[PDB]
Design a protein around this ligand. Sequence first.
Ligand SMILES: [Cl-]
Lengths: 116, 116
Amino acid sequence: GMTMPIFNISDDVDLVPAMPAEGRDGGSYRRQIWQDDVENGTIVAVWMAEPGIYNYAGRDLEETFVVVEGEALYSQADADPVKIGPGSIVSIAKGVPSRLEILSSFRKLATVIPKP
Amino acid sequence: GMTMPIFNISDDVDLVPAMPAEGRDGGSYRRQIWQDDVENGTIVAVWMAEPGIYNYAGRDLEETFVVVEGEALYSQADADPVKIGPGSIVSIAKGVPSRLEILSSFRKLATVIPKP
Ligand SMILES: [Cl-]
């Protein structure tokens, strides 16, 4: 029959370099999985990152992600970092800055709703 | 979480019972994590289910989920089943039926995009 649209988050395939970690010029990668064919459509993508520090300014979008592999110290805005790991699910509102201090090779599936 | 919108897929918090496996009367729950603040927008939710057969007809929605806990034999339409487990990412197009034979206590995080 036909092959189903099933992917393995662990597989390093079609990963495109994304944000580098502080102090070096590499660290994270993104793999788009699905995008709606409407303007400002919902996007689902894999983000993988190696240990290091990743700072994100507030962005014009809503995101919810789930961690499948790895651990990180995570914060939004002025909150003290909290440890997240496999099974953690995180939502971050439009315009809210965030920081990930990745502790071990980390993979999340992220749902992004553009809010231009 | 106490300080941020950090949830854990393993928490049995704000559960809503969901349709059980065909030969069962419980062991199936949903937990809504996030919904877009529009009339009929994207929803991100946990589903947690015990071993058994779960059949779904095609629905007027697009979905992508990732398995975080447990294993299942999984098929869509006329495809031969494949075993999915932690890290498996599955997309289901509008109108495509599916069958999930859960083999061990299962939790997924699903993104659902309504498509009337
Ligand atoms: Cl928290």
